[PDB]
Amino acid sequence: GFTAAQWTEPIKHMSMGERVKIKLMAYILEEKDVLILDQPTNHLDLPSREQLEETLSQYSGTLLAVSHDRYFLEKTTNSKLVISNNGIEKQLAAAAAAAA
Amino acid sequence: RKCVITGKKTTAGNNRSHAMNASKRTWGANLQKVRILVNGKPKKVYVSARALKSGKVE
Amino acid sequence: MRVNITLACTECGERNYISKKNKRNNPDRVEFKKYCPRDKKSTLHRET
Amino acid sequence: RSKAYDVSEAVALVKKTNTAKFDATVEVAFRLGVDPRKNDQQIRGAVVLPNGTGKTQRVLVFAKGEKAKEAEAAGADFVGDTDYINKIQQGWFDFDVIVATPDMMGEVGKIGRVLGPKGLMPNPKTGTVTFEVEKAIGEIKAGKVEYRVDKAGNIHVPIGKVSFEDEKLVENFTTMYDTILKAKPAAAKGVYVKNVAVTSTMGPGVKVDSST
Amino acid sequence: KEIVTLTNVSYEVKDQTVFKHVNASVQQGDIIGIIGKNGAGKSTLLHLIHNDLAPAQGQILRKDIKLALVEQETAAYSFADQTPAEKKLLEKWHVPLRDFHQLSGGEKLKARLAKGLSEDADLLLLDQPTNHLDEKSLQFLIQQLKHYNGTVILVSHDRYFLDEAATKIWSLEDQTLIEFKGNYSGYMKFREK
RNA sequence: GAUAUUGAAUGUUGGUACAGCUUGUACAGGAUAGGUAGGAGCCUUGGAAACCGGAGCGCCAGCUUCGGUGGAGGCAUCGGUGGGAUACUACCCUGGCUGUAUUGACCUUCUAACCCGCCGCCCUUAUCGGGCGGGGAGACAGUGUCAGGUGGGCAGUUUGACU
RNA sequence: GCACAAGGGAGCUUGACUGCGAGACCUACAAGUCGAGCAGGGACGAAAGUCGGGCUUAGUGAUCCGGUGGUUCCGCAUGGA
Ligand SMILES: Nc1ncnc2c1ncn2[C@@H]1O[C@H](COP(=O)(O)OP(=O)(O)OP(=O)(O)O)[C@@H](O)[C@H]1O
Ligand SMILES: Nc1ncnc2c1ncn2[C@@H]1O[C@H](COP(=O)(O)OP(=O)(O)OP(=O)(O)O)[C@@H](O)[C@H]1O
Numbered sequence: 001g002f003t004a005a006q007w008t009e010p011i012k013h014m015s016m017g018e019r020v021k022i023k024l025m026a027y028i029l030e031e032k033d034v035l036i037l038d039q040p041t042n043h044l045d046l047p048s049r050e051q052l053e054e055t056l057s058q059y060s061g062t063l064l065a066v067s068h069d070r071y072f073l074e075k076t077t078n079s080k081l082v083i084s085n086n087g088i089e090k091q092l093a094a095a096a097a098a099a100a
Numbered sequence: 101r102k103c104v105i106t107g108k109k110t111t112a113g114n115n116r117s118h119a120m121n122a123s124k125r126t127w128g129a130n131l132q133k134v135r136i137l138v139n140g141k142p143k144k145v146y147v148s149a150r151a152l153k154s155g156k157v158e
Numbered sequence: 159m160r161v162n163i164t165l166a167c168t169e170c171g172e173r174n175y176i177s178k179k180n181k182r183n184n185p186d187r188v189e190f191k192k193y194c195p196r197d198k199k200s201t202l203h204r205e206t
Numbered sequence: 207r208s209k210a211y212d213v214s215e216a217v218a219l220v221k222k223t224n225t226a227k228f229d230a231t232v233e234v235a236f237r238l239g240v241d242p243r244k245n246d247q248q249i250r251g252a253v254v255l256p257n258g259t260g261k262t263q264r265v266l267v268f269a270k271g272e273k274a275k276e277a278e279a280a281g282a283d284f285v286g287d288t289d290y291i292n293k294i295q296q297g298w299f300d301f302d303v304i305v306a307t308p309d310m311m312g313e314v315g316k317i318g319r320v321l322g323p324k325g326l327m328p329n330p331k332t333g334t335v336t337f338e339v340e341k342a343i344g345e346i347k348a349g350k351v352e353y354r355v356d357k358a359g360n361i362h363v364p365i366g367k368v369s370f371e372d373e374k375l376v377e378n379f380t381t382m383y384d385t386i387l388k389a390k391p392a393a394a395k396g397v398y399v400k401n402v403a404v405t406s407t408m409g410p411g412v413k414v415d416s417s418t
Numbered sequence: 419k420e421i422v423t424l425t426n427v428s429y430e431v432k433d434q435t436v437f438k439h440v441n442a443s444v445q446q447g448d449i450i451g452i453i454g455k456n457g458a459g460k461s462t463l464l465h466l467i468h469n470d471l472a473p474a475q476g477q478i479l480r481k482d483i484k485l486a487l488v489e490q491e492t493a494a495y496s497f498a499d500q501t502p503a504e505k506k507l508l509e510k511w512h513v514p515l516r517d518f519h520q521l522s523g524g525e526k527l528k529a530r531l532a533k534g535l536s537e538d539a540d541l542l543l544l545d546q547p548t549n550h551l552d553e554k555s556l557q558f559l560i561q562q563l564k565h566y567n568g569t570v571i572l573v574s575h576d577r578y579f580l581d582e583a584a585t586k587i588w589s590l591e592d593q594t595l596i597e598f599k600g601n602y603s604g605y606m607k608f609r610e611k
Numbered sequence: 612g613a614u615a616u617u618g619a620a621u622g623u624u625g626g627u628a629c630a631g632c633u634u635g636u637a638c639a640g641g642a643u644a645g646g647u648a649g650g651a652g653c654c655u656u657g658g659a660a661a662c663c664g665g666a667g668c669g670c671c672a673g674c675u676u677c678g679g680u681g682g683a684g685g686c687a688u689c690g691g692u693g694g695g696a697u698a699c700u701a702c703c704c705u706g707g708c709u710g711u712a713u714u715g716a717c718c719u720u721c722u723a724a725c726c727c728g729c730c731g732c733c734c735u736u737a738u739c740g741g742g743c744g745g746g747g748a749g750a751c752a753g754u755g756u757c758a759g760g761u762g763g764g765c766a767g768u769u770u771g772a773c774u
Numbered sequence: 775g776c777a778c779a780a781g782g783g784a785g786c787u788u789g790a791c792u793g794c795g796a797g798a799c800c801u802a803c804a805a806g807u808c809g810a811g812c813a814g815g816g817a818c819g820a821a822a823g824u825c826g827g828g829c830u831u832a833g834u835g836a837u838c839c840g841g842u843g844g845u846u847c848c849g850c851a852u853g854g855a
Contacts, residue, residue, distance in 0.1 A: 002455070004433050016490055017456025039523070042549035043490075045456050045575050068524075068552055071578075121767095130755035132616045134724080144741085149616050149755075158724090166843085173843060177790055177827095185432045193791045193815055196844090200791090200816055206843095208630070226653055226698090233649075235701040242703090243484070243538055261649075299689095302649095323695040325648065356647035358703040364649060407699050408653080502694060503645090509637035510670095565705060 001025060002048060017043055024052075036064040041072045103131060103148035104138055105156060134158070163188065165203040170196045175203060216404045216414045217375040223409030224368040230407040231260065232375060233364050234382065237400035240391065242359035247394060249361060250331050253385040254349030257374040260367035263347050268306035268314060268328065273339050280343040291317055300326060303352070305334045305342055361386075368406060379404070383416060420445045421541065421569065422467060424595075427476030429462055436462060440476060440595040442588055444541065444569050451580050451602065452573040454590025460573045461489065463590070464543045467571075488534035488544035494518060495530045507532040511555050524550040540568035547572060548579050559583070577602060 002021055006014075011022055020043040027035065037056075041049045049072065056063060057075045065076045080091040089095070102109035108129050115123035130149040135142050136156060147156065159182075165175040175192050187205045194201040211219065224230045240247035266284050269277040274285050283301075291314060304321070306314060306328035314328065321327035328335045332352050336342060355361050365378035390398065403411035422444035429437040436459040444450060444467075454460045465471040467478060468485045497518060499505070508515060511528045518526070531547055547559055560582045563570050571588075574580055580587070580602035587598050587605050598605050 002457070004457070006433055009432070015457035017460065021456075039550055043456070043546070043575075046577060048456070049575075068550055070553065128755050130615060132725085132754070134616090147616095152616075164843090171844090174792085175790095181430065182432075185430065190788055190790095191816085192788075195792050195814090198792090198814070228652070230699090231649070233700060237702070243540070259649090319694075323646095351648075354647075356702075358646085358701090360647080360700095360702050362648050362700065401701090403701065405700060407649085409699080411700070505694075506637065512637080567705085 002045075017045075020044060021048075033060075034062045035059070036066075038066050039068065040065075041067055041069050101129065101131065101146065103129060103151060104136075104145045105147060105151040108148045108150065163205055165190060165192065166206040167194050167197070167201050167203050169201045170194050172196050173206070179205075211412055211414045212418045213376060213379060213414060214372075214418065216412050217379075218372050219412065220375070220404055220406050220409075221368060221372075223406040223412075225406075226408040228407075230368045230409075231364060232366055232368060232370075232404065232406050233362065234379060235401070235403040235405070235411065236361055236363075236386065237403075238355065238359045238361065239396065239398045239400050240359050240394060242355065242357055247359075247391050248355060249386065249389050249391065250354045251385065251389040252332060252350045252353040253381060254345055255365060255378050256381060257366065257370065257378055258348060259351070259364050260370065261364075263303055264301040265303045265305060265343055265346055266301065267339055267343065268304070268310055269339050270307050270310045273307055273337065276340040277343065280340050281347060282343050294320060300324060303346060304328060305339070305346070307337065307339060308335050311335050421482055422478075422480045424467070425477050425479075427466060427473050427478055427595075429459060429466065429471070430474045435593055437590075437595075438593050442595055442597050444571065446569070448569050449563060449583055449585040450569065450571045451584045451587050452571065452590060453575070453580075453587055453602070454573075456575070458590045460590055461545045463588075463595075464489075464545065464571065464573070468543050482540055484537075484539050484541060486534050486537060486539035486542050486544070488531050488542070488547070490545045490549070492530055495526065495533075498533075501536060503536040504532050507535060510558060527551075528555065535562065542568075542570045542572070544570070544572050546575070548574060548576050 001024075002018070012019055014022070020040070024040075040052060044052065053072055053075050056065070063076065065073065067073050067076075082089040082091050082095075110129060111127045113125055113127055115125035117123065131146045132149050132152065133144065133146050134152065135144045136147060136158065137143070138145055159180070160178055161181055163177055163179050164173050165177070165188075166173045172194060174194060179188055189202055189204050191200050191202045193199070194203075220232045223232075238249065240249065242248075264283050265281075267274075267277050267282050267286075269285055270288065277285050294317075298320070304326035308330060311328050311330070330336070332354065333350075334342065334346075334352055351364060353361060353363060363382050365382060366375055399416055402414050402416055404414050405411040420443045424440050424442040427437065427440040428435060440463075452460055452463065462471065464487070466473050467480070468487050469478075470487065495518065497515075499515060505515075508529060511532070513525050513528050513532070515529075518529075521529070527547070527549060528551070531544065534542070534544060548556060551559070556579070559579070563583050570583075572579075572583075584602050585599060587602060588595050589598065589605070589609075598608055
């Protein structure tokens with residue numbers, strides 16, 4: 001999952017384009033059954049965020065995926081929370097223009 | 101083949117390649133046959149292209 | 159791997175010495191105090 | 207406008223570039239050939255005009271200690287009670303020119319940008335912050351104006367009036383151009399001269415020669 | 419003309435040789451993009467050209483001194499709110515100034531990249547400007563960099579950001595830089611070929 | 612392929628040498644303030660408020676120019692804002708059009724160089740060549756130097772020792 | 775060959791020094807090996823002393839041609855190059 005023979009580096013003498021990866025391994029090694037991804041896809045790589053785009057679709061639910069990308073969430077969205085003026089908007093579709 | 105104005109003709113030297121292999125090679129005159137009055141008449145002789153630039157009357 | 163090492167001076171800047179070291183067991187630039195015959199004393203040297 | 211006029215013609219012609227009703231001021235623009243992004247190629251020096259500018263100044267000083275005692279006789283309007291920046295706070299119609307001395311400059315400076323976007327902040331790069339306050343009042347009223355360049359490398363200089371005679375602005379532009387030649391920094395890349403625009407206040411510019 | 423040249427530039431740390439036999443050129447307004455696997459010297463190269471890190475081998479020659487370094491995690495970034503062209507950036511993007519520690523992660527790169535664009539720079543050495551940005555700010559980047567004073571060198575990890583905002587690519591790979599001019603979409607067409 | 616024989620025009624996209632000048636707003640605001648310096652007034656019968664039309668940008672708020680109806684009105688400090696004041700001076704190269712001179716490249720087209728193992732006439736009873744007159748190709752081709760590729764078609768050679 | 779450690783620990787360290795080197799072994803040559811001691815500067819030790827790599831013997835190659843560094847060297851008349 002992207003490491004060289006780097007078993008012992010200090011983990012923010014690491015690369016810092018790892019250390020998102022360290023968090024990630026520490027999650028996905030242990031089947032924690034609930035994840036919340038407060039912006040994962042930005043430090044990662046085009047071969048790295050892609051497999052997280054893929055496997056999180058085959059993930060067994062209860063995911064809270066904050067992502068400022070528009071194309072990452074196209075594999076990891078069923079419902080949306082559009083935070084807006086005066087609090088949340090719990091959307092289940094696009095929910096624009098007030099369907100009539 | 102020599103130029104009629106000056107004594108400029110084909111010489112010979114070496115084709116020195118890489119590894120300094122000395123092949124044997126010739127060196128021609130840029131001559132360019134034109135019509136000039138070498139006598140009182142024009143005769144259409146060989147000239148040279150060194151001697152043709154601005155010097156000799158066409 | 160094992161690398162040839164020159165050890166240039168600091169008081170004189172002169173090279174004066176060679177020994178070998180690892181790039182893995184000694185990844186940092188190594189320094190010792192040796193004898194500088196231009197400086198005629200013990201002087202801290204420096205891999206260059 | 208295709209022709210570059212001479213110095214002896216443009217002084218007599220910026221007489222004729224007075225259009226409005228006030229007795230106008232002839233000023234000079236000069237395009238520099240230095241890099242304004244670098245702080246090393248920075249021309250910032252001022253000099254006295256031998257025939258003056260034609261305008262009344264009001265210089266207020268920040269003299270400290272004994273230096274106020276020679277500041278009240280040279281011609282300054284108001285010196286101060288050693289601190290009137292509190293009077294500067296919430297008010298302070300500034301008038302013409304602010305100079306200071308190299309002791310309280312730091313203290314006045316730590317007050318903020320009440321002088322930043324107003325162009326009067328004391329800075330010893332301009333010869334305005336010194337121990338000679340008596341010699342500093344007397345040369346600014348009769349000549350010297352604080353001169354520094356913009357963020358694109360240009361200097362503005364008031365050399366005088368419309369009503370000056372033809373032999374006044376020639377020495378004024380000669381003195382300022384010779385000053386620009388002595389104020390040339392090091393590592394100047396290429397051609398130093400780009401443009402001289404001699405103009406009046408109400409009229410366009412005339413691009414003229416530098417050395418005639 | 420070029421401005422910065424690189425020749426056989428290498429780097430040594432305690433993994434292995436990150437980086438070797440590196441020949442590249444920065445020019446007068448090129449939009450150069452670093453791509454590469456993370457950990458492959460993607461931003462160690464930026465500290466080599468900044469002279470933030472001294473390279474073990476190879477010669478790095480530069481001409482113009484101004485090196486704007488905008489990295490990841492600058493970790494209680496300063497509040498020298500000076501040279502107010504920064505505040506134009508700080509107010510198009512809709513970011514308040516008031517704190518640093520209580521801000522979200524989203525605002526802080528937009529308040530660091532703000533100070534970085536406007537100190538003065540004819541050369542940008544920036545790590546990742548496309549982390550926690552929305553599209554109204556991601557689109558604002560490309561209108562900055564197209565309408566920009568000089569050369570930009572960025573480490574994107576985006577096929578999105580480089581279809582618009584690239585002229586060269588300095589792809590880091592198996593310890594070797596290779597450069598390709600023109601786009602990123604045709605770049606992988608070039609690599610696969 | 613370049614260059615020399617080998618020049619005559621018409622467009623083209625870059626760049627200079629001389630030249631035109633326009634483009635400029637996060638919010639607060641009466642608005643579109645790029646900043647450094649002077650600044651309490653300037654513009655007007657060689658035309659102001661207003662209407663209208665169009666080149667032009669625009670982050671569509673409102674600006675910019677020019678021309679046409681109009682008839683003595685605009686506009687500035689100060690008033691307010693906010694980080695900073697509106698009447699000239701320059702620039703900033705962010706974002707255009709037009710002309711002069713060359714610069715590089717490309718497309719056409721011309722003809723006078725070159726070429727014609729094309730025709731006719733003469734030298735001349737000559738399938739040579741060469742003078743003239745047409746025709747065709749035509750800055751190409753050919754040819755000279757320089758260069759890269761290709762090149763057993765040819766050439767000199769090498770192709771070890773112990774055993 | 776070694777248990778007086780050459781085998782094991784820990785502290786402190788850079789002698790894995792510079793200029794050498796009487797005299798030897800080895801050997802066709804080119805080379806190779808050992809070297810007390812002297813001086814300069816050190817390390818450890820209270821001192822005596824020991825230290826010019828490792829327990830000895832392997833871990834490597836001539837010249838030519840180029841590179842780098844330094845030098846009271848030369849430098850095609852002179853000063854430089
Ligand atoms: N300071 C360091 N010291 C030792 N090893 C390092 C250091 N920095 C990085 N490394 C190793 O080299 C790898 C590459 O680091 P580099 O400097 O390329 O960051 P980067 O990969 O460019 O940043 P990103 O991961 O966002 O691309 C690191 O992941 C780490 O394994
Ligand atoms: N403790 C706090 N004090 C003051 N302001 C806060 C605090 N927490 C959040 N905010 C403000 O809330 C705004 C939005 O922050 P939020 O927590 O939504 O992160 P965000 O906007 O998604 O940014 P990012 O995407 O970088 O996380 C920010 O402008 C921030 O200043």
